[PDB]
Amino acid sequence: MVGLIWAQATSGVIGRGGDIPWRLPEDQAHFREITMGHTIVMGRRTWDSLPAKVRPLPGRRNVVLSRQADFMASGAEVVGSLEEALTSPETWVIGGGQVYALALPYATRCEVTEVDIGLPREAGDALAPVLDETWRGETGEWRFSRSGLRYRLYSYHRS
Ligand SMILES: NC(=O)C1=CN([C@@H]2O[C@H](COP(=O)(O)OP(=O)(O)OC[C@H]3O[C@@H](n4cnc5c(N)ncnc54)[C@H](OP(=O)(O)O)[C@@H]3O)[C@@H](O)[C@H]2O)C=CC1
Ligand SMILES: CCc1nc(N)nc(N)c1-c1ccc(Cl)cc1
Ligand SMILES: [Co+2]
Numbered sequence: 001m002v003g004l005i006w007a008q009a010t011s012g013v014i015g016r017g018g019d020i021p022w023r024l025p026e027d028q029a030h031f032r033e034i035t036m037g038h039t040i041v042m043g044r045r046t047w048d049s050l051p052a053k054v055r056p057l058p059g060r061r062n063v064v065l066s067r068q069a070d071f072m073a074s075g076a077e078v079v080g081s082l083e084e085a086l087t088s089p090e091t092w093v094i095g096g097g098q099v100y101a102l103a104l105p106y107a108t109r110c111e112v113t114e115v116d117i118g119l120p121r122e123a124g125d126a127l128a129p130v131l132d133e134t135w136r137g138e139t140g141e142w143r144f145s146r147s148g149l150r151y152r153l154y155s156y157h158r159s
Pocket of ligand 2 (some may be wrong): 005006007027028031046047049052093094095110111113
């Protein structure tokens, strides 16, 4: 099982300037719950976005995708292809934009947090991948985050 998990603005933006233009503690808890214990695969830029004092993310096999043969990610595995990372029973691809696009053919689940923030797409933004007709989607109710933004959770599945 390979799943993708991301939070997006309604526009599809997931990242800007190498970081994220919101922070929802409820989304962080959801992300932690879904990925805990499992493999997490991230692009090198997403690894770079984590403060050194917080990485590797606890309780998970942290894997970083990079073209750099000597790139060192202390506390993680660095691999040069996504296929190398898929050896565990449950694998979550945790971003960013480039790696979601690369992982989508292997994926059967997408766990999406939609953040009700009006954020037009700008050049250089990382975006959520486009899900074609093979994906079945299940939507939760809109909720209020303590950060003031509404959010809702989608669960997309396909065989
Ligand atoms: N809202 C959310 O849920 C999430 C948001 N984000 C945001 O997304 C943004 C980062 O996403 P993005 O900029 O797309 O960068 P990625 O995190 O997708 O990492 C890109 C890097 O992955 C490596 N890579 C890409 N393609 C390949 C390949 N074919 N083979 C080997 N290695 C490859 C390269 O590493 P190298 O250059 O070392 O070769 C490349 O620079 C940030 O803003 C981050 O905050 C991140 C995760 C989730
Ligand atoms: C809590 C933010 C978040 N929410 C969701 N729904 N998915 C994610 N993949 C992330 C995320 C973004 C960047 C990093 Cl470094 C780790 C996780
Ligand atoms: Co689990």
